[PDB]
Amino acid sequence: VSDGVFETMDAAVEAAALAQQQYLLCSMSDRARFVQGIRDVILNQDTLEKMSRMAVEETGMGNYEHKLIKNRLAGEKTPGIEDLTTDAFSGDNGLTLVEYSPFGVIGAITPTTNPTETIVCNSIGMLAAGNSVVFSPHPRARQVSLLLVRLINQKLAALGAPENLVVTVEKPSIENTNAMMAHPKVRMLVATGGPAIVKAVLSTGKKAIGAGAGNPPVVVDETANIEKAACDIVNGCSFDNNLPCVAEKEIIAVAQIADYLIFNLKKNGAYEIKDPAVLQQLQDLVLTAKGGPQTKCVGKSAVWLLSQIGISVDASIKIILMEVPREHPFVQEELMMPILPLVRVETVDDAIDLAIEVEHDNRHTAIMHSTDVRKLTKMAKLIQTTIFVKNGPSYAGLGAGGEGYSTFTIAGPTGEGLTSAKSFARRRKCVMVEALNIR
Amino acid sequence: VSDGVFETMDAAVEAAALAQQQYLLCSMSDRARFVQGIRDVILNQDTLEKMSRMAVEETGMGNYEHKLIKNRLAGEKTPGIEDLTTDAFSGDNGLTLVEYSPFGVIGAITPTTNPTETIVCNSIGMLAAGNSVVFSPHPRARQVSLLLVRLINQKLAALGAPENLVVTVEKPSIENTNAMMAHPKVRMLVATGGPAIVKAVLSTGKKAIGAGAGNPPVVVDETANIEKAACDIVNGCSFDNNLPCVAEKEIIAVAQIADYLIFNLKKNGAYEIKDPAVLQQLQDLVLTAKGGPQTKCVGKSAVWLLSQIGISVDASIKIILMEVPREHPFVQEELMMPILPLVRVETVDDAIDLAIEVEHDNRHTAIMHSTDVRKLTKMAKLIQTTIFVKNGPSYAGLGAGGEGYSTFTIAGPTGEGLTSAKSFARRRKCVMVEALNIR
Amino acid sequence: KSPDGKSNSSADAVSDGVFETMDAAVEAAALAQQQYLLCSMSDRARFVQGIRDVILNQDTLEKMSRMAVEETGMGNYEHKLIKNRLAGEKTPGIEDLTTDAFSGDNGLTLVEYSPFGVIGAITPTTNPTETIVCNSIGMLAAGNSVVFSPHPRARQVSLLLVRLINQKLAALGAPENLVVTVEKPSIENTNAMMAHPKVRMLVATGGPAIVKAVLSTGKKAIGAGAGNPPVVVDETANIEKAACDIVNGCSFDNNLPCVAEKEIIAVAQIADYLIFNLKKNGAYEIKDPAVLQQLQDLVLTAKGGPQTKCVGKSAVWLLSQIGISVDASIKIILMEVPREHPFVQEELMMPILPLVRVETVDDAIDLAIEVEHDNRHTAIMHSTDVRKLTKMAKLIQTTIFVKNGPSYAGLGAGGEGYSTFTIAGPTGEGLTSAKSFARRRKCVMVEALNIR
Amino acid sequence: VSDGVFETMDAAVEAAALAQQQYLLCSMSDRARFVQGIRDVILNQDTLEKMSRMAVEETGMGNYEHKLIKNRLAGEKTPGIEDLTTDAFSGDNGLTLVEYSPFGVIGAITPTTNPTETIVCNSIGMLAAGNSVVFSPHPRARQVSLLLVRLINQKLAALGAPENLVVTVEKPSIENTNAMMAHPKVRMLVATGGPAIVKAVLSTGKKAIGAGAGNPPVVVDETANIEKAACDIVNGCSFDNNLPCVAEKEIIAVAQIADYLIFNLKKNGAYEIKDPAVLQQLQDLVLTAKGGPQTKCVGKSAVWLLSQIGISVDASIKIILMEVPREHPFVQEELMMPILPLVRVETVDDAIDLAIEVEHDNRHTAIMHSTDVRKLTKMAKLIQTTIFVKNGPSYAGLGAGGEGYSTFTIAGPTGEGLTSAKSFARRRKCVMVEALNIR
């Protein structure tokens, strides 16, 4: 049986195309079993700890126990075939049904920040909708991505699936990626990555879903539970060392509570920098001459980042915290590091205005800690982000401590929000004229 | 006050950008009032007849009485703000809400086959979802498009809307269209047109909705009500002179009812060509050297077409009918003329196979006449079309004799199905952690 | 196989709705509902629209509103104008009759809302015309006929409404007697309706006695309960808006409506600021114990119950009856009393609004749960704290909960959602609509029409 | 710790009142653990086998193999807390949420035909909705019911549930029932039983749901797959020896295919009686002179029934078939036995009219075998049954080979259809005025 890995992109696409044709002859029960099969692969404790541990060691980014939670989140709260609902309308003209049907072959680009959660997430959703998927993994995570694909192909083969429902290439590269985007038998492109690769898949003449970039602010006003907010903000900021694109990247605190917030942040493992000389070193380490993030510090722990400036702290420190002006490079930039600047503002209305401004119109993600229903409503409505989290860690926006399903492909410019099976399906309308209206 | 027509595409876009930002401050009541303004513009009897006269006069395509019905269908059955529904989940983690929020400025490309209906239905849904729209109409329908835009802007001014919610250019052209595709302030493209213009919009780096092409076959098996099927097939095929994208374009009939079906088709106004010489005359009239459809014949009545080959008939003749092999140009090509080839096949399973094959994987529209629930199920399920109509004219898939709403932007390649306000909105998730779970 | 297909050879003075006997009314409704099953959904929709036109016709709108106040002595013309129009515009139609679909390997399952048959509806003297408009739209949209047993105190306005409905439905080609009543309403006739074998379902909008009775008849019954809606205000509320909303909700139709505020439970640190804004919004505050006692004499019977002589009269009127003259800006009578005061414990249905001062927001919630007497009908809260709004709504478990608005926002007037005037109490249907008056049917197409 | 069994009805109601108050403070996650616990009890292979044969042994009704299927259906396909959905509506006036909330203590009356499945189905749905349940079981299934209640109380005790979530009485009697209906703390009665007990619970001054009686016809017309129809009809009629209240109980066949159907009926396990003397023996055995069914024969097998009249057949015989006029006692009566009268009629429309007539305006369950979508629509629309199955066995209407969920409390007069958790909840509406409209 094929393990799903192919030497060329064209060979993988052609096998996925044959596989999806065979897939159309499978029942919905087969789909459910295949979906459950993919959950069982990642939710198996040894494979969970293998994938989490293996991604840290090969990418050098993130940390092990947080990938346990993300990988389990993907396998547990990704919607299966139940996502493919049916609408019906019956009256004098008959019955109309609206269904979610497969697209065909979907090419899927996966990131080095969430290599396995994206594959688990994309695979389950795309296979639920009746598609086959070709993965072009990130080269920094190519061995952990390939191992997951091989494990999935073994499980699906064991469960009776057509071979090659989930395929990838042996040597991931952007050259294979560009061949995937050009291939006539790829009917849909899904890019989870930075804004360059998303613009690329929206330029190939075919249906594309692209993730978005975000610089998520978290506002805290005087009505918030400060103790809980500090716990949630540390947890959300240091989650997988600030790799997730929903992770908090600057605090905008109302002055009335800012100090007591900083106090409680420190209690939860924030390391506060007050010396501008120490702050200067950290700027020179984590930023280029550009002013933006430096790749070698992305995804690193706070303990690690601090050791590089000669400060030795134990494992209880999870984030590095500093109060700075709004113009500081750490607020304007999307560092993807557990370095959390705090801007002090006079009023909640000022906090909302700055949060909107600092969000750079990404319309991606924003967080607020407030119990005032009017202020929660006002900031949510104005900032207009794909995800908005009130009184919890940012990752509650993905189903970890918040209601709803989870995903690791969050659409930016294409508008689908948190993708699921439904997002990988074509809507069909079936009209039974003057019959089956049995009301 | 501005009338909506700008001299340059740049001026139209930026004015639409200003408008959409003002629009963001309006209530849902204001949207509902503006949506009702657009309906009133097109449903006013004088404008309704003026828009249908001008469209035929200016494009030469379609007929007045049927554009009267299609424009009214766009004004009455296009969804409004009630299309913008809300999802809610509540439990131990609080409340999650999912809303349909505005995109921004939408660039919409409109066809010469359906200029006013596309503008009416694009406008309603895009404005219901809180966007502004820049229209880039087809030059063959410039005068009627701009009048309709100016009428919309006038009525919206009377309603107190932000100026320039609906805009276009004075002299529409392909270069204005390309300027609209390139403009950074256009957040989404919507193209109702041929395969080329849909590939263009999917190659711009933006989100695009593309309403592709079809070759809708109609299968008639031995269990059908043949009398009713003949009436439906003529009515659907000839509706607005075969201009609509769903209109019947070739019959595939089981051999045992084929003759009786033809007799009934003739009974309902199909002119049958038996003489092979006359049939060759028609082929040379309506097909170019490369075998493609002649533009001068698109949307012409059967009376006109037959007159061009020396046959004089009265207004009761609605389509031209001919039995031919499956390889015949009228089968393989999409003609958009009330010319309806018939292909005779041995069994209903042969008919389904040929229908799938001749449809050319457009997965757009198919029609079946059959009272056999298993063959209806099999054909609908196998052919995987965006619209499938059972025992009805093709336009029962547009809300005219079938259950559901109407659209004139039917997305094949991009998978949205029958577009409406939802299709022109971003999806946003709002997570209220550990609160508002009042069950 | 057939060479010509399969044709469909087998597919092919006026009553005013008022009857001298309940049994003739029921029998006429039974025949009507059978004819109705031959009508199309389009017919249902024109008939539903025709009911809306009766009550939203400006003449009839004014006539029904004014006539109900003249006939009953309860309520006021301007608000019944608003309530009748609310029933006319925001009562769901046939769109309420949604279809559930499930498709997969075993085919297609459809779930539809189909007619019960003859419904007998008991309507109250408080909202005679709104309940009749609201029931008739919902019940006919679902494909039923309805027999009305109205209250004798509202006989004329109810018989007139049923007659006007029957005239309009006649003009629309409806089967006669889709909506009927009796010429002489009575408790005798109501009992006869509850007992009649051809009545498939009973819908009662009234007090607990009549709700208990319909649940004792051996047939399907919807019971629309009652309660004593508390309005809780805490220190996070917008007090200037709370006071305005509280005056408006309490004085709506002179505190008749099923949801109207009936006691304020105020957090002490904002209590006096609340009272100050309540008087600014048209509250007459009684502070003199002598005068407060005079009003108790007037509005309470010897048995400690409310005087029906005073139910639904304005605050102007009630103050005039104790020698206090005030102009039309006074909308409610307001007084601060202990939690056991009769005005708190009873349900007066009068624009009389006791305020009880408590210490914390958690005491306000506990008291609101207590004074609601486990009706779990309605409660209101003014508060911006998303935790306290959640705690109160979750704990008090009312059918309707309104946050930071007048109570009547729970019926579609200033709040999202549709309207109704039959709010189910014991039987748990919530805000009744066409769906509530339907049988749920399941049609299973085995291994066909799974076209996904 | 309590085992759930109480000496007096009042003690069980008083215990269940305290339990449900305690249940209110449990979480939705607790309910899900308690619902999964009940599924784990009945789906345990040892308990499943014991529950299915102890029911047969104590009641003398049904058969072992089929109760395995039915208890499996109750445990697997009964909806859980996911049944309690949430409606939201947002706009200028804010947010409105609608939720499904507990009633309190529910008194449930279970039948002798489906004692254990009803207890599994009721308690799962009632506990998902946040209720406790006092069962008042049928006296002849006393010992299997109390065992199930004890096993349930043991599992929940192991899950940390409040004591007495599911309770019953030590000696089931109808006077214990009469205590349950009168107890004021019982906020809702649910009677799964005959027409007397249903009228009773509807005469108590409380909210009541009541099961339905039906005389379910199965029409077969000349368009049906007769091989499959006969196989489905035998399997459906003999399912648990015709005990379920959806089972086929008279065939109304179109004459043109009647003899071919009887042929396939016989091949699938139907023993046809043709001799009128043998037929009269069967009536005296299974009927009284009142006309009513003999309780001694209810739920018995076809082999057992034929044995009493001296006829010896093997276990391949599943039902007893006889062609009779429409007025025959087996047509008019409701035998709940694997006895299947067949009526011959000329036309499918006569079959439909006869089906309607013989159903006795119960509007409960009806079946049709036909491939004509017009005739399936006509019969379904006109007969207005709570369940309607097309082209499958009766039990496909309960989710066994048909789409949808399963129940064993099918409402008759009270209208709720197939009960689930929703049916045991109060609809509450929460209105947030001018806030949380975050669209």
Ligand SMILES: CCC(=O)SCCNC(=O)CCNC(=O)[C@H](O)C(C)(C)COP(=O)(O)OP(=O)(O)OC[C@H]1O[C@@H](n2cnc3c(N)ncnc32)[C@H](O)[C@@H]1OP(=O)(O)O
């Ligand atoms: C809540 C969780 C979520 O929301 S999931 C979405 C999170 N993932 C992302 O946002 C991905 C973007 N992240 C970044 O760009 C970061 O800066 C980091 C992690 C540093 C990226 O590492 P870096 O070493 O700079 O490489 P790169 O990703 O920028 O890519 C460089 C070139 O390779 C390409 N590339 C990217 N991914 C793939 C892929 N899966 N397969 C094939 N090619 C890939 C890029 O397009 C880029 O190409 P080029 O430089 O233009 O030649």
Ligand SMILES: CCC(=O)SCCNC(=O)CCNC(=O)[C@H](O)C(C)(C)COP(=O)(O)OP(=O)(O)OC[C@H]1O[C@@H](n2cnc3c(N)ncnc32)[C@H](O)[C@@H]1OP(=O)(O)O
């Ligand atoms: C019924 C529901 C619906 O979907 S609404 C109708 C949808 N209409 C379609 O799918 C396309 C049907 N029309 C056509 O195919 C052709 O236009 C017809 C009328 C048949 C004849 O083509 P012809 O006479 O040569 O005109 P053309 O469109 O090919 O030439 C225009 C070229 O300019 C471009 N163009 C297309 N639309 C616009 C527009 N609105 N504004 C500016 N430019 C436009 C196109 O690129 C087109 O060139 P090209 O032929 O596509 O290569």
Ligand SMILES: CCC(=O)SCCNC(=O)CCNC(=O)[C@H](O)C(C)(C)COP(=O)(O)OP(=O)(O)OC[C@H]1O[C@@H](n2cnc3c(N)ncnc32)[C@H](O)[C@@H]1OP(=O)(O)O
């Ligand atoms: C599709 C799957 C389904 O629909 S299954 C659920 C549908 N409902 C049923 O199957 C109920 C079965 N309906 C029937 O008519 C049964 O055939 C029989 C056994 C005849 C019911 O009649 P019934 O009088 O109740 O039985 P019986 O002769 O043994 O006498 C019992 C007496 O006790 C009563 N009873 C009934 N259930 C209970 C109970 N759980 N607890 C206490 N009492 C009960 C009965 O009313 C009867 O009393 P009485 O004869 O009226 O004085």
Ligand SMILES: CC(C)(COP(=O)(O)OP(=O)(O)OC[C@H]1O[C@@H](n2cnc3c(N)ncnc32)[C@H](O)[C@@H]1OP(=O)(O)O)[C@@H](O)C(=O)NCCC(=O)NCCS
């Ligand atoms: C409004 C109210 C003041 C009625 O005025 P009233 O004069 O005090 O009450 P009445 O004595 O005239 O009517 C009640 C009696 O008539 C019966 N009754 C109620 N409605 C009836 C009807 N439509 N037809 C016949 N009898 C009816 C009741 O069962 C009751 O009988 P009982 O007192 O012997 O037990 C008040 O008593 C009430 O009934 N409130 C509940 C109504 C309500 O709030 N409906 C919700 C509005 S949407």
